[PDB]
């Protein structure tokens, strides 16, 4: 986050749903559906070797260090995230209230700070 | 046979497919359209650098 990013998310408010995710949600997402961009190829994060080859220069040798940088938005975020392929999440179990409108007017779009976790648990 | 006269409807979309390219930027432009008196003099300078070469 920063002014530069948040103004773009304002400009597309109606199409997205964002918020502040919790630690468990970060674990579930990375561990279960982690796939790195290695040599332009979507390859599965199954061993640490696959990380050491690429990110050894930032002392990033494992899933855990990765987590640490993400939660503590450390120095090497750009590289840690650009390494990660966009997360292919499924359709939401249970359903959605109403795609079109904002949360405050009883919808799903826009900033719903914490309730994103509930939504992740319903989509994963 | 009356017919529509002018519009600009799908034009933007045509232009942006291949891109609104910037002009090819380049250091060292030509010196075309530069005050001849000045240009004469610069030409004579480049002509006579040879004479004061040894000191350098």
């Amino acid at each position: 986050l920063n002014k530069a990013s948040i103004n773009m998310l304002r400009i597309v408010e109606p199409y997205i749903a964002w918020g502040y995710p919790n630690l468990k949600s970060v674990n579930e997402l990375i561990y279960k559906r982690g796939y790195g961009k290695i040599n332009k190829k979507r390859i599965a994060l199954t061993d640490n070797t696959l990380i050491a080859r690429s990110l050894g220069k930032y002392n990033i040798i494992c899933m855990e260090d990765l987590i640490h940088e993400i939660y503590t938005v450390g120095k090497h975020f750009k590289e840690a995230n650009n390494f990660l392929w966009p997360f292919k999440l499924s359709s939401p179990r249970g359903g959605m209230k109403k795609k079109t409108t904002h949360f405050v007017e009883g919808g799903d779009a826009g900033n719903r700070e914490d309730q994103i976790n509930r939504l992740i648990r319903r989509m994963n | 046979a009356k017919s529509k006269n002018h519009t600009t409807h799908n034009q933007s979309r045509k232009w942006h497919r291949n891109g609104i390219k910037k002009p090819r930027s380049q250091r060292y432009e030509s010196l075309k359209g530069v005050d001849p008196k000045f240009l004469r003099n610069m030409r004579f300078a480049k002509k006579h650098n040879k004479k004061g070469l040894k000191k350098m």
């Binding site: 920063n2 002014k3 | 045509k14 232009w15 390219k21 910037k22 002009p23 432009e29 530069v34």
Partner: protein
Amino acid sequence: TNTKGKRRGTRYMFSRPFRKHGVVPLATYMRIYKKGDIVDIKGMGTVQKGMPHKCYHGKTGRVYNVTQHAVGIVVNKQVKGKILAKRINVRIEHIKHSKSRDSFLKRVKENDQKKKEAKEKGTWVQLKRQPAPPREAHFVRTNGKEPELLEPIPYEFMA
């Protein structure tokens, strides 16, 4: 169809402001323009000789040529999809030094200063600009009295 006259739609653009008619202050003339200096354009009605065409109004460029009383100047005009760098002969009165570049040049000079110092010391000074961050945590001392309760006023029809 409209006409393709040179001064079409310039009823207000060139008109001089309120109580600022008359003579042109002499700084305009007596100030100097080097090559490669970034210069922004502003038409002026008093001098009809050497007015730029209204399209180039507002546009800012760099000076490729100099004469007694004028400067040729490079600008990027957009036409139907391609841009064209093209050069215009403007008499000085319609011109200002754009001050955008000066702050950057101040920052380079500041970094070379800030690098010479804090070099022998070994402290690593942040050179880069860093975007506006999320404000940190803090304490709000409610020293004493309590918050004033605001109530929505009831409606009343003035009209």
